Amino acid sequence: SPQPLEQIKLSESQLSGRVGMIEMDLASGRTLTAWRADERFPMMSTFKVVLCGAVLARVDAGDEQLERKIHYRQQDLVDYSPVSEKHLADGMTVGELCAAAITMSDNSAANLLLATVGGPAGLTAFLRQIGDNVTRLDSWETELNEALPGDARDTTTPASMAATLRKLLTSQRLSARSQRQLLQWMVDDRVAGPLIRSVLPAGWFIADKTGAGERGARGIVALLGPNNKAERIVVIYLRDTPASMAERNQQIAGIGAALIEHWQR
Ligand SMILES: OC[C@H]1O[C@H](O[C@H]2[C@H](O)[C@@H](O)[C@H](OCCCCCCC3CCCCC3)O[C@@H]2CO)[C@H](O)[C@@H](O)[C@@H]1O
After folding, report:
1. What's the total number of domains in the chain?
2. Ligand 1, from 26, 199, 234: best to mutate by most atoms within 8 Å of Cβ?
3. Which residue, of 21, 74, 174, 200, has the fewest CB within 10 Å?
4. Which ranges of the chain does DSSP label H, i.e. alpha helix?
């Protein structure tokens, strides 16, 4: 593979799209590779990790319980609800809703959770409160995936998202149990995790959440590292490309491959 920045540039040229990327040491927050790290990209389903961080903050405060059941109606469901549509009769616990949102990308689960934190405005307030002054959620599922050209709504930047993920996972803002839960949900991703594992060299840790949206929007937030260790946060977003989903996937994979082949800093 080319060197990481070389590969990232090639991905833009080939997709005729914008790529944004950061690679960050998990333990220290040291920024390692960066590209358009201060530019705005749709979060899409990657927002669900931040959402469940806010939910866990409420649990830690005793204002929420992972075991609390939420009940809802078929008329509440939005597009793509593989787990939540199965529980119209019995409801789902808050913990199961976060598991469905993160591990299956369930959109109605995410909306039910989003309401518990005060909606898009509440989640944005939580972000400001942890010192992310950039990331913003404005819409619910599935409008938050619209990726309107030039729109600031429902965006993050690679740098802000990486810093925020690090805060949630390691800063002790969340309790020990909550930090561990948020990572385990990402470890358990069923959408992309198994596929990624199947193609990663032996010895590499992976945890992830992916997203997809309109106008080619695509992304991944991940923890990655050799020696079976979660060493670095890698955030990669794509926007404004007409390319097939297959090609967007392949380009993100190519950027990942370049980072892995050229890991030593
Ligand atoms: O610009 C597109 C690139 O497409 C390929 O990339 C290949 C790569 O050579 C191979 O090594 C990998 O297989 C392994 C996939 C690695 C996945 C890494 C997972 C990452 C994803 C991002 C977050 C952290 C984990 O596939 C991709 C896509 O076909 C080739 O390198 C080359 O044609 C071109 O430079």
Report:
1. 1
2. 199
3. 74
4. 4-15, 47-60, 94-104, 107-116, 119-129, 158-170, 176-187, 193-199, 245-261
Domain region containing 180: 1-265
CATH assignment at residue 163: 3.40.710.10
**Cα distances (Å, whole numbers) of residue 116 to 58, 120, 122, 135, 214:** 9, 10, 9, 19, 27
- For a ligand 1 pocket test, name from 1, 6, 195, 237 the mutation site with the most ligand atoms within 8 angstroms of its C-beta: 1
To one decimal, the resolution in angstroms is 1.3
Indicate the DSSP class of residue 2. Answer: -
State the method: X-ray
Q: Assess contact for 158 and 235: CB atoms under 8 A.
A: yes
Active site residues: 45, 143
Q: What's the CA-to-centroid distance between 79 and ligand 1, angstroms? A: 30
Phi and psi torsions of 188, nearest 5°? -85, 10
Annotated binding site for a beta-lactam: 48, 105, 141
Structure-token pair, residue 153: 């709504």
Ligand 1 nearest-atom number relative to CA 220? 23
